[PDB]
């Protein structure tokens, strides 16, 4: 291990003490191996099937049911008679649900893949190393390589480790450092050293990163680090370090069971304290074991009554559907629960190139020099039409087309653009459109010459595919390209050496075509070319050039400026060291300015207003781009992120300036800034770190492994469709269209989804509330239990289930994006709403009881035990308070239960209608606003009857009831709930809220 | 209410003023009801669950612990630090034991049924009465009947109240007055009056007792009394009046807590007076609150140290087991504690018929007249073999078989036996033995004819079941039985009127076959039959008959003599009033003697020696039988209750003679008598009354509600297995085999049980004694407490528990029944034994202290604070007497405690071996005499270690100790106890005792 892109090749072979010619001795291998370790990432997936199923039994709720399944299970074991076997239905049911539960929890973790699991898929299986114990090339296992030994790589190979390059045996070494960033554009490596000890991998031009591919050539070097010590390994560690918090819903939803559990235990203590008879009057007698079961018989019906089971199933059917929905919107949410956290989006950090813009580079402006004198200089502004890369378009001055060949400076300008370019074009067949081969920014430079056509080459004679590089091939003949000094973030410029085509052996006639950022390049020109003539360089002409760069850079028409110069009298060919990237800038000196060109990265059509929406939605958007702070701001002003004329001094920083500030001022700027330019590496994480210290649900974008740590810390990391897999597997969403708008699009749908959920979640635990009350009266008024766990179950699982599901389909409330984001703190049930369900609950919990106690007392036709004093007993052990009779077990009648049970069903089907909106009467909120609701309602009802007359079913649940004035009681005992509701529903006018 | 079996039917309707035809007017009902009351027994079971649990908190011991659970509970509330919550174990433990205690005390009273509760189960739910407000038969509630109104009863009915019969509408009225006595033999009722105003229910032949059943017919009468005024009600009152004293153990065991409590309060006062420092030296300072806890910290460990809790659990495991034991001996003890009072049995009162004897009646002798002359008369002695009822046997004179048909007198003798009998025979299938149908004494008379066979009827042609009544059916043809004058205790005889079978209408030829006790019958014969001839009756032949009755009655071969005569010329058929039982004797006059028969009630095989045992065991046995004093004594002489030739004049009384004596002479005779004949009704109680005035633990036997008051007053009332339920539920034991011996059998086992108990009870409070001493030194020598309540608990509950339990299994000491009964006064601990445990206690109470004080001072490896002067302080508030140091809390080390705790355990495991016998060295009393002891001992030890190394446990109790010369101290500090013991154990030789 040795982070050394700064140490020289010698200093490195030194540190490790090795021989580039022999290698590490079989001994040093053992020594180093045991010192450092196996070169591989800790493989971990210790999620055993056993432990797995168990993990699905830690949630208090599912636990409460368990203990509730025991009692039940044992209560069906303690009964006399031959029908004591028909008592095992209830328990088997419960446990079955507890099982089907675990099943599902285990069938997700099977396919539930993580990103860290992906990295391992980036490090190769085998590698070529040269050990001193031999001579040939032995290809050991990539897992067995160690820092220190010498390795070899060639085309197609996947770099096995962090490798400092010693010698590049091919003519040039090239690599696909894509997995790191995404820019497929291979890069050129070198052997010379890099001074800055703390330099970005991007500037480590003599290192080979593990996971990378040898695009071109073959070289050998010395392994500096391995395992989780390598660039990738570091990231994998950072990712394995991030603590991913639980969805706010999940949190809220969790505390609920925490409380529900508590309450339940309170009802139990209360109950006992209510009926403290035997503990104060009953003598020995014998009703001591019976008076026991009853107390336990009601606990199980105390759990299934409180536990809103079946809800999870609903929240899921809902999410899934919501998910498949967004899918059609080019938005792919991976984590089902995220569809919720999404809609709470406080802030959004999106990348410019490719999300905010289309990334369809295009040269539209370009000025050359016209003439210079005693401070009197003139330029030669231009314009070119052509959004696409196709040669479709024409150059024009003063909005009037001119012929390029008519201007000298434009022919040379066109030279460079062509000979200093490294990209090609091609006409697609299937698509029949012009496609780009190579760097965007280059292909455009190509397209420029393909238009200008400074040489009038017949193209109307060549097909669409043929003239793909017409005016280019022609200029490729005028000059024979010797070599090229690749662009470097260093001198931020690029060149290319080449000579004529009718030459022999003779010193003179060699050209160097430089292409770079105005600043540097221009700062290296000593001469200005005026067509064919060339004259020196002065303050006048210079500023007259720069300024315009600014016009074009910060002006309304946001453009990328690229300076073009040419070295007329370059150094003797046999005097250039084409291996010292450092020497390139010096070679590219004493230049001759030839022109400038402005490009454009068109802001996506849709982003235009999508930004606006976020302002309406109070969702902030911070743009992260590689553009200079200067043009960066301008681009923002152009997409609306900034006010065309507002001060943004303290609202836009550059990666550099950012680090300059102390963690105090650092965290501040994050709540205000909206534009980061030339953002450093570990910055999306720094930004997400802070945007979180202010409890803002953040959205981050970007791809590449060196971009996964941030997509994991954000509340909703976002990856492009075309992005890398690590990114995708490491993200909440995957913009298929890579189009920013798609984010806003989804964010909204999230808001809509959590709204309709928030309803059915209330509609559901509401029935539970009432249910409990019911089970609580029957416990105080010793009445036969009106409801049994079995029924209650079918209820919260089916009867209520459907309306719950339909209640998700509630039409999306408008004025959805005109409000700030939902605070994660915002509870589902509070204040008035609390008291409201508090009532709706008490009502049903009471109505249900008396809906059966009526079948006993005021009963029209039945055991009319009018004021029999059921509250007093169910003893009948005496049978004396009842003068004459030979039957008392009537108490356990199925008519009264089915009465209450039908009452519950009636109430809920209605209460499911009082849910289509929180505080709106049904007269403004017609039940037919949500047809799916009225629909399910019917399937819910015919189901109720389906379990009352269909011979089998009415056996296990309860007996049926006749239309014979039976149901009418039901209705006249239920419907009023709507009134209670509606009353309390729009009783909010008298409290100023809506 | 009106006790009137003496008033006539008129006089009765008079007293109450009612009309047998109309009845009581709806008014008189109210009037009488409010005068007398509801006809029912006061229902009482006011044992509320609340009060119940409370009743289980009045015992000083359990109370002391309570106050001891408070301090503890509050001491764990007054502590600083985060581990102040680990202090709630101790209290929770205590209270838990106090709770589990109450639990058990309540789970017994639930099923703990009483006899009085049974009586209520004898009075019917409804009854038929004729009120003057109607005509038909209205069946009101048996609870609503009142003295005065007319009732009706018929077959199957259960007599609702005390009813004087007015008219018997059926041909004859019969009743099952079983619940009163047990003799299932129904009785015949009448309407005529009974003169004697104070006559036994048995002679109240015109009354119907509540709880009784109408065996045959249907009659009506007038209710004379109800409620607790009826025969049954009286008894229920007597039973509810008896004060049942607490078992002698319970008494002794009670005074102990009474004293233990006292002592404890003395140790406290002493302690304070011991360390009176702060009250004489300490200035203000601040160790005033610490010096407080300590004083309270040792009180709780002063209670749990003294209170031998866990003992009750032992005395129970012991008793239960002892109980299930006797169970296999046909002895069923109902009250667990009785297994103790049993073994102290001073005297035993057993019933002859069925307990002392087998009650398998059998005629073995029978003499008829041979010839008479001038004072010259000869008889005709006989013999018949046949223990069982089966016809298996043959009549024989001079030991040589003769044919019955050859003697005239024997054919007639056989007539009566058959026609004057009212019982049948039958051959059982399952058992394949001859069973008896009817009165024992009759079936035998039947079996007699089934043998004699005076008519040579072929029976070897009929099955076993067929000839069941052969020679009988034959004689049942010779004479047609008209009617029968049922036996009455009055003329102590019975008859039967019948005529020939080839008759018309003609005065002459009617016979009356009389069957009774020699005395009366013979005294009514004017003629003697000599075969076919008949001659008068004279002094000679008469005495020649009587005498032999005496021979056979008092002679060695104890027999029941029954005289047989026949009235030749009875009164004209149409001249007998078959309704005036009084007129029967006169009808049965001018008789003709026909023969005599001797029976035998075989003394149970086992009783033979069982009586002897009691003499060895100094247990007196008094026989209560219905035999005449004459044959009674003889029977006693035969079973050994009496010396074959000793004077028993003042050692045997008849129910009559008994009452004749004044309460002065009455109570006397009870300590001397051993045989009561013709015992009156309220006499078993009178006898138990007296046998108790001499502090004799009495055993009484017998069954029937009219026999429960006595079974409740006796120290151990005894009921037969076949007895009535009131009796059983009203008794201490239930002889399943009804065989007297079973009593002696059990009585012995009781002695064995209280012996082994007496040991473990001593072994247990012994550890307590020592324990306290320990807790008393630590209090004087201010040493850190060597022992904590927590440990001490595990001790007296487990470590000591097991050996206690095994110590119950100590093999039964021989010479068990050769000693008089244990005096109830005899204390468990006194004299030398006191001083002995006084020492064994002081030793352990000291050894334990120094077993920890050693870990401090002389400590080999540890806080070797050699003579540190711990007695001086545990202050360290100064930390100056200890020059250099930064730690003092070492004091609260777990090593020293576990040291003492292990010391205790070692000592007790040994002291549990010094218990297998009071004054016997282990060299004569090997520890392997009681394997269960050596066994538990191991489980006791491995348990000790189990709470020292098993991670969890060693946490709450204390730390462990290494074999590394640690335990050796333990052993070398414990074992010597055995020496101390053994020394003091057999130091009794020098004091003449063993
Ligand atoms: C499932 C059924 C029941 C009855 C339950 O225990 O709900 C309580 C409870 C735990 C809360 C309450 C319920 O409180 C009561 O009903 C008070 C006791 C009365 C019952 C006695 C019988 C007469 C919720 C259910 O109901 C009402 C109507 O007030 C609403 C809400 O729940 C939510 O927002 C959770 C939604 C996911 C919570 O106040 C919640 O406490 C919280 O912390 C929240 C914020 O969770």
Domain ranges of chain B: 12-54+113-240, 55-112+241-345+746-994, 346-358+603-745, 359-602
| Minimal C-alpha gap between B64 and chain A (Å) | 25
- How far apart CA A888 and CA B231 sit, in angstroms, is 37
The span from the CA of B364 to the CA of B386, in Å, is 8
Contacts of A809 (CB under 8 A, 6+ apart): A756, A930, A932, A933
Binary contact (A283, B112; C-beta < 8 A): no
Nearest to A305 by CA among A769, A957, A777: A769
Using what technique was this structure determined?
A: X-ray
CA of B182, closest CA in chain A: separation in Å? 30
Nearest to B794, CA basis, from B825, B771, B763, B769: B771
Measured between alpha carbons, how far is B102 from B53 in angstroms, rounded to an integer?
6
Residue A863, min C-alpha distance to chain B (Å): 26
Q: Is B353 annotated as a binding residue?
A: yes
Residue for token digits 């002391």?
Answer: B64
Q: Using CB atoms, which residue from A283, A286, A288 is nearest to B48?
A: A283
* 8 Å CB contact of B112 and A284: yes
- Report the distance separating Cα A501 and Cα A524, nearest Å: 28
| A492 annotated binding-site participant | no
Chain B nearest-CA residue for A285? B110
Percent of chain B as helix, strand, coil, to the nearest 5: 45, 15, 45
Task: Find the helix or strand (DSSP H, E) in which A789 lies.
Answer: helix A789-794
Residue A280 at interface with chain B, using a CB cutoff of 8 Å: yes
**Distance from Cα A260 to the centre of ligand 1, integer Å:** 7
Scan residues 96-115 of B and list those with Cβ closer than 8 Å to A.
109-112
A260, A268, A269: which to mutate for ligand 1, most atoms within 8 A of CB? A260
Q: Give the three-class secondary structure for A643.
A: coil
**Which chain A residue is nearest to residue B51, measuring alpha carbons?**
A280
Distance CA B761, CA B766 (A): 8
Helix axes A831-856, A894-911, angle to 10 degrees: 150
The protein residue with its alpha carbon nearest to ligand 1, atom 40, reads A256
A764 C-alpha to center of ligand 1: Å?
11
Quote the minimal CA–CA distance from A947 to chain B in Å. Answer: 44
Asked if A883 reaches chain B (Cβ–Cβ under 8 Å), the answer is no
Angle at A921 between CA A918 and CA A927, to 5 degrees: 90
Give the binding-site residues of ligand 1, using a 6 Å CB cut-off.
A 252-253, 255-256, 259-260, 263, 267, 306, 308, 761, 765, 768-769, 772-773, 776, 827-829, 834, 837-838, 841
Beta strands in A640-757 (DSSP E): 652-654, 675-677, 698-700, 716-720, 733-735
Cα-flanking dihedrals φ and ψ of residue A494, to 5°? -145, 150
User: Tokens 């969702």 label which residue?
Assistant: A619
Secondary structure class of B107 (helix, strand, coil)? helix
A305 is annotated as contributing to ligand binding: yes
Tokens of B754: 């209280």
Closest residue by Cα to atom 33, ligand 1, is A829
What angle (nearest 5°) sits at the alpha carbon of residue B767, between those of residues B764 and B770?
A: 150
**Between chains, do A284 and B50 touch, taking CB under 8 Å as contact?**
no
Atom of ligand 1 nearest to the CA of A260: 10
Alpha carbons A495 and A511: distance in angstroms, whole number: 10
d(CA B161, CA B210): 4
Query: How far apart are alpha carbons B87 and B80 in whole angstroms?
Result: 11
Nearest alpha carbon, ligand 1 atom 31: A829
Q: C-alpha distances in angstroms, A732 versus A104, A249, A347, A716? A: 21, 16, 15, 5
Token code pair at residue B47: 């044992």
Residue A836 CA: nearest ligand 1 atom is: 28
Among candidate residues A24, A217, A226, A54, the one with its CA nearest the CA of residue A124: A226
Only one residue has tokens 């479709």, namely A392
| Encoded tokens for B422 | 């009212």
Q: In what order do the strands lie in the sheet with B698-700?
A: B652-654, B675-677, B620-625, B347-351, B698-700, B716-720, B733-735
Measured between CA atoms, the residue of chain B closest to residue A284 is B110
The dihedral region occupied by B243, where left means phi > 0, alpha psi between -120 and 50, and beta the remainder, is: beta
Q: Other CB atoms closer than 10 Å to residue B347's CB: what's the count? A: 25
Q: Which member of A279, A286, A288 has the closest CB to residue B50?
A: A279
The answer to whether A351 is a known ligand-binding residue is yes
- Option in A278, A279, A284 nearest B47 (CB): A284
Q: Compare CB distances from B46 to A279, A283, A288 and report the shortest one's residue.
A: A283
A405 is in an annotated binding site: no
Distance between Cα A829 and ligand 1 center (Å):
8
What is the distance between the alpha carbons of residues A702 and A738, in angstroms, rounded to a whole number? 10
Using CB atoms within 10 A of its CB, is residue B892 exposed (0-12), middle (13-18) or buried (19+)?
Answer: exposed
Name the residue among A884, A891, A896, A822 with its Cα closest to residue A854.
Answer: A896
Structural domain A359-602, CATH architecture: 3-Layer(aba) Sandwich (3.40)
Give the CA distances from residue A403 to residues A452, A453, B11, B255, B339, in Å, rounded to whole numbers and listed in that order: 8, 8, 159, 132, 132
In angstroms, the first-to-last Cα distance of chain A is 64
239-278 in A: which are within 8 Å (CB) of B? 278
With H, G, I as helix, E, B as strand and everything else as coil, classify residue B745.
Answer: helix
B47 touching A, CB under 8 A?
A: yes
Q: How many residues does chain B have?
A: 994
What residues of chain B lie within 8 A of the CB of A278, using their CB? 49
Q: B12-54+113-240, which class in CATH? A: mainly beta
Contacts of A358 (CB under 8 A, 6+ apart): A601, A602, A603, A604
Chain B residue at shortest CA distance from A283: B48
* Residue A829 Cα: closest atom of ligand 1: 34
**Cβ–Cβ gap B45/A279 under 8 Å:** no
- Chain A residues whose CB is inside 8 A of the B109 CB are 284
Closest residue (by CA) to atom 1 of ligand 1? A306
Q: Find out whether B759 and B313 touch, Cβ atoms under 8 Å.
A: no
- Please check whether residue A880 touches B, CB under 8 A: no
The kind and range of the H/E element at A566 are: strand A560-567
Catalytic residue among B149, B157, B162, B351: B351
User: CB-based contact (8 Å) between A879 and chain B?
Assistant: no
* Core vs surface per residue A670-700: b (16+ CB within 10 A) or e: beebbbbbbbeeebbbbbbbbbbeeebbbbb
Q: How far is CA B179 from the centre of its chain?
A: 19
Superfamily covering domain A346-358+603-745: HAD superfamily/HAD-like (3.40.50.1000)
Nearest-CA residue for ligand 1 atom 46 is A256
Q: Is A489 assigned a ligand-binding role in the annotation?
A: yes
Cβ of B43 under 8 Å from any chain A Cβ? no
Nearest neighbour of B109 by CB, restricted to A278, A279, A284: A284
Distance (Å) from CA A813 to ligand 1 centroid: 26
Q: Which CATH superfamily is domain A55-112+241-345+746-994 in?
A: Calcium-transporting ATPase, transmembrane domain (1.20.1110.10)
Q: Does the annotation flag A304 for ligand binding?
A: yes
What resolution in Å is listed for this PDB structure? 3.1
Nearest to A282 among B48, B109, B112 (CB): B48
Chain B residues close to A280, C-beta within 8 Å = 48-50
Q: In what order do the strands lie in the sheet with A150-154?
A: A128-130, A150-154, A218-225, A162-168, A207-208
Q: Is-same-fold flag (B12-54+113-240; B55-112+241-345+746-994)?
A: no
What is the distance in angstroms between the Cα of A273 and the nearest Cα belonging to chain B? 14
Nearest CA to ligand 1 atom 20: A773
If you count residue pairs, one on A and one on B, with CB atoms under 8 Å apart, how many are there?
A: 24
- Asked about B351 being catalytic, the answer comes back as yes
**β-strand pairing of B620-625 with B347-351:** parallel
Q: Work out the number of other CB atoms within 10 angstroms of the CB of residue B647.
A: 8
Please tell me which residue in A157, A351, A422, A981 is annotated as part of the active site: A351
């Amino acid at each position: 291990m040795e982070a050394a892109h700064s140490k020289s090749t010698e200093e490195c072979l030194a540190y490790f003490g090795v021989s580039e010619t022999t290698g590490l001795t079989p001994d040093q291998v053992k020594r180093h191996l045991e010192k450092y370790g196996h070169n591989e990432l800790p493989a971990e997936e210790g999620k055993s099937l056993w432990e797995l199923v168990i993990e699905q039994f830690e949630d208090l709720l599912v636990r409460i049911l368990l203990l509730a399944a025991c009692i039940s299970f044992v209560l069906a074991w303690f009964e006399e008679g031959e029908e004591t076997i028909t008592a095992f239905v209830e328990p088997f049911v419960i446990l079955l649900i507890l099982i089907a539960n675990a099943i599902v929890g285990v069938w997700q973790e099977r396919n539930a893949e993580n990103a860290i699991e992906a990295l391992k898929e980036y490090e190769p299986e085998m590698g070529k190393v040269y050990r001193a114990d031999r001579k040939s090339v032995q290809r050991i296992k990539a897992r067995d390589i160690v820092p220190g030994d010498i390795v070899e790589v060639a085309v197609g190979d996947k770099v096995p480790a962090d490798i400092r390059i010693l010698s590049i045996k091919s003519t040039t070494l090239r690599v696909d450092q894509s997995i790191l960033t995404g820019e497929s554009v291979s890069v050129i490596k070198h052997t010379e050293p890099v001074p800055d000890p703390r330099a970005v991998n991007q500037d480590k031009k003599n290192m080979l990163f593990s996971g990378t591919n040898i695009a071109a050539g073959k070289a050998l070097g010395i392994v500096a680090t391995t395992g989780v010590s390598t660039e990738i390994g570091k990231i994998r560690d950072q990712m394995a370090a991030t603590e991913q918090d639980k969805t706010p819903l999940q949190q809220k939803l969790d505390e609920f069971g925490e409380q529900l559990s508590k309450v339940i235990s309170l009802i139990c203590v209360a109950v006992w304290l209510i009926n403290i008879g035997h503990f104060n009057d009953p003598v020995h007698g014998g009703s001591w074991i019976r008076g026991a079961i009853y107390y336990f018989k009601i606990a199980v019906a105390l759990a299934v009554a409180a536990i809103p089971e079946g809800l999870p199933a609903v929240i899921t059917t809902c999410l899934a559907l919501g998910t498949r929905r967004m899918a059609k919107k080019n938005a792919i949410v991976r984590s089902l629960p995220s569809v919720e956290t999404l809609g709470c989006t406080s802030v959004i950090c999106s990348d410019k190139t490719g999300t905010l813009t289309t990334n369809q580079m295009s040269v539209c402006k370009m000025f050359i020099i016209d003439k210079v004198d005693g401070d009197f200089c003139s330029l030669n502004e231009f314009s070119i039409t052509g959004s696409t890369y196709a040669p479709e378009g024409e150059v024009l001055k003063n909005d009037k087309p001119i012929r390029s060949g008519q201007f000298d400076g434009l022919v040379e300008l066109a030279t460079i653009c062509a000979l200093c370019n490294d990209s090609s074009l091609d006409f697609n067949e299937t698509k029949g459109v012009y496609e780009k081969v190579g760097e965007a920014t280059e292909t455009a430079l190509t397209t420029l010459v393909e238009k200008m056509n400074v040489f009038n080459t017949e193209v109307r004679n060549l097909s669409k595919v043929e003239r793909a590089n017409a005016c280019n091939s022609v200029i490729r003949q005028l000059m024979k390209k010797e070599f090229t000094l690749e662009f470097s973030r260093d001198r931020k410029s690029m060149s290319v050496y080449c000579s004529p085509a009718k030459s022999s052996r003779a010193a003179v006639g060699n050209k160097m075509f430089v292409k770079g950022a105005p600043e540097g390049v221009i700062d290296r020109c000593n001469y200005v070319r005026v067509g064919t003539t060339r004259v020196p360089m002065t303050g006048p002409v210079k500023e007259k050039i720069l300024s315009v760069i600014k016009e074009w850079g910060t002006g309304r028409d946001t453009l990328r400026c690229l300076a073009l110069a040419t070295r007329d009298t370059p150094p003797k060919r046999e005097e250039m060291v084409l291996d010292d990237s450092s020497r390139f800038m010096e070679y590219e000196t004493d230049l001759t300015f030839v022109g400038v060109v402005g490009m454009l990265d068109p802001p996506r059509k849709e982003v235009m207003g999508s930004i606006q929406l976020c302002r309406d939605a109070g969702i902030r958007v911070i743009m992260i781009t590689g553009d200079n702070k200067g043009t960066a701001i301008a681009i923002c002003r152009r997409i609306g992120i900034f006010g065309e004329n507002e001060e943004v001094a303290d609202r836009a920083y550059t990666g550099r300036e950012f680090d300059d500030l102390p963690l105090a001022e650092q965290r501040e700027a994050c709540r205000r800034a909206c534009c980061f330019a030339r953002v450093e590496p570990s910055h999306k994480s720094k930004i997400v770190e802070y945007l979180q210290s202010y409890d803002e649900i953040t959205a981050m974008t970007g791809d590449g492994v060196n971009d996964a740590p941030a997509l994991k810390k954000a509340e909703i990391g976002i990856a492009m469709g075309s992005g890398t897999a690590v990114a995708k597997t490491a993200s909440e969403m995957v913009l298929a269209d890579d189009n920013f708008s798609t984010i806003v699009a989804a964010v909204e749908e999230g808001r809509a989804i959590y709204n309709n959920m928030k309803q059915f979640i209330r509609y559901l635990i509401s029935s539970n509330v009432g249910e409990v009350v019911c089970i609580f009266l029957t416990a105080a008024l010793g009445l036969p239990e009106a409801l049994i766990p079995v029924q209650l179950l079918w209820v919260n699982l089916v009867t209520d289930g459907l309306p719950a599901t339909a209640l998700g389909f509630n039409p999306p409330d408008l004025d959805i994006m005109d409000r700030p984001p939902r605070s994660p703190k915002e509870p589902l049930i509070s204040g008035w709403l609390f008291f409201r369900y508090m009532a709706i609950g008490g009502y049903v919990g009471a109505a249900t009881v008396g809906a059966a106690a009526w079948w006993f007392m005021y009963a029209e036709d039945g055991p009319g035990v009018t004021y029999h004093q059921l509250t007093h007993f169910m003893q009948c052990t005496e049978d004396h308070p009842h003068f004459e009779g030979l039957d008392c077990e009537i108490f356990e009648a199925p008519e009264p239960m089915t009465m209450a049970l039908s009452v519950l069903v009636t109430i809920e089907m209605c209460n499911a209608l009082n849910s289509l909106s929180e505080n709106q009467s049904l007269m403004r909120m017609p039940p037919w606003v949500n047809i799916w609701l009225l629909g399910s309602i019917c399937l819910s009802m015919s189901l109720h009857f389906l379990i009352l007359y269909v011979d089998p079913l009415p056996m296990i649940f309860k007996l049926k009831a006749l239309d014979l004035t039976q149901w009418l009681m039901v209705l006249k005992i239920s419907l009023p709930v709507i009134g209670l509701d509606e009353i309390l529903k729009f009783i909010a006018r008298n409290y100023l809220e809506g």
